[PDB]
């Protein structure tokens, strides 16, 4: 074992996202890189992280494997540790963070969607908070050249350059979603300042996707309301 991520903060952002429901997770190390998944009990919200090996400054294993670990302590340590790299290496895993400002070396031991738009976590955070004030269910839809969001009552319209960076709608669609599942997914985009892609369709899952600045994707799938 030896995995070297370029930025500790991005990996900090990843660990936090895949741990909303529980502090326990399963990291998967394969030839293609790291994969991680968590799905809520009602299976309405799926959290997915994919880190391709070519994004890592170094990657090495001896055989594709999974590790199941408790991530709670490493969460709060890194919450006080903050620019640095992060290493991972009988009873479990070992994590190395090295600050090049202070010089401190810190080691932690542990045992087909029709509609498509691109924006940021800022806008999505405004929407999630707006929706939660008025109701527990969000309806998202297409109205001509803009995107309509309805809750309660609350209505919002998103269009290109107001605020959307990208909008593509090849077929009209509407879908309803749990406001709290949307809120949780949008929360999971914290630390990722990259553009955020949202996708949906007629009564189908919503996909929320973001690449980390140094590479790797944080993905959220939300089951529709039927």
């Amino acid at each position: 074992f030896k995995i070297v991520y370029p930025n500790a903060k991005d990996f900090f952002s990843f660990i936090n996202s895949i741990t909303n429901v529980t502090d326990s997770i399963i990291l998967n190390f394969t030839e293609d890189g790291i994969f991680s998944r968590h799905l809520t009990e009602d299976k309405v919200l799926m959290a997915i992280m994919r880190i391709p090996k070519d994004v890592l400054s170094e990657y090495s294993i001896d055989s594709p494997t999974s590790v199941k670990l408790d991530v709670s302590s490493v969460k709060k340590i890194l919450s006080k540790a903050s620019k640095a790299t992060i290493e991972l290496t009988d009873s479990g895993l070992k994590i190395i963070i090295r600050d090049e400002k202070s010089g401190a070396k810190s080691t932690i031991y542990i045992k087909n969607l029709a509609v498509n738009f691109t924006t940021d976590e800022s806008v999505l955070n405004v929407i999630a908070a707006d929706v939660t004030l008025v109701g527990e269910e969000m309806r998202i839809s297409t109205e001509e050249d803009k995107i309509k969001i309805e809750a309660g009552r609350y209505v919002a319209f998103l269009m290109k350059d107001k605020p959307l960076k990208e909008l593509s709608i090849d077929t009209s669609a509407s879908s309803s979603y749990s406001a709290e599942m949307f809120k949780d997914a949008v929360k999971g985009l914290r630390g990722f300042s990259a553009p955020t892609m949202v996708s949906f369709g007629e009564n189908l899952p919503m996909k929320i996707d973001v690449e980390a600045v140094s590479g790797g994707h944080m993905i959220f799938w939300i089951a529709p309301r039927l």
Binding site: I77, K80, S106, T107
Partner: protein, 241 residues
């Protein structure tokens, strides 16, 4: 020659004082700044007698320093924090006195915020010797130290400090290995110290670039902050064991 205002000091860096007093307020309810000819001195043993802070601020650090009579300013520490907190970015503070039973504190701005305060008498305590013979002295980053204490404290109340020739390590039994600007070695050391008490003084790390850390087997932990005017803050903490 004795003037109506017989003691008057002007300090133009209230953040320093604020960082000092914030740590002091965690340790004791009342304390004494003794303004002497050459420096302002403050020594305070915490309420449980488990730790000790000692402060020396040379007169050179001040914009105006007028003291012939040594002057003992006894104060409630929470209240002085509130006073110091009135100040905005790089406003000065004046501490003055016309008679031994009162102190005038002015926060200097376009209009002054004037505090007329009763001078307190504060009982004298037996004070532990601060300069013992330690087994190791390591100078490291002050930010680094603060970060290491915070990291380790989320997981334990037992801050372990391990000294070796080339390394100081700050541990939960998580390990933070120093980065090591200077080191003085006699014997390899290991001891542990309370995170609660260390948390008390994290504002002192703001006072200097580097902290001198001294400790040893069955010896207290000393923290020494040498500041840019010749000011010195020392903190002594008994082992937790």
């Amino acid at each position: 020659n004795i003037r109506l205002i017989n003691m008057k000091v002007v300090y133009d860096d209230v953040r320093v004082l604020k960082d000092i007093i914030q740590a002091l307020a965690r340790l004791v309810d009342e304390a004494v700044l003794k303004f002497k000819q050459d420096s302002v001195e403050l020594v305070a043993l915490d309420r449980a007698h488990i730790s000790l802070i000692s402060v020396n601020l040379p007169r050179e650090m001040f914009k105006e320093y007028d003291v012939n009579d040594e002057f003992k300013f006894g104060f409630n520490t929470q209240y002085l924090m509130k006073i110091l907190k009135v100040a905005k970015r790089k406003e000065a503070i004046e501490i003055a006195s016309e008679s031994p039973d009162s102190v005038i504190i002015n926060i200097i701005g376009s209009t002054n915020r004037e505090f007329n305060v009763r001078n307190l008498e504060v009982s004298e305590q037996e004070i532990p010797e601060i300069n013992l013979q330690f087994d190791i002295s390591a100078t490291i980053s002050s930010d680094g130290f603060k970060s290491a204490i915070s990291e380790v404290s989320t997981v334990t109340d037992n801050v372990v400090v391990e000294g070796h020739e080339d390394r100081i390590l700050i541990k939960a039994e998580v390990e933070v290995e120093f980065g090591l600007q200077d080191l003085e070695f006699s014997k390899e050391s290991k001891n542990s110290y309370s995170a609660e008490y260390l948390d008390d003084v994290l504002s002192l790390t703001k006072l200097s670039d580097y902290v001198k850390i001294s400790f040893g087997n069955q010896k207290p932990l000393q923290l020494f902050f040498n500041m840019e005017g010749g000011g010195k803050v020392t903190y002594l903490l008994a082992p937790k064991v």
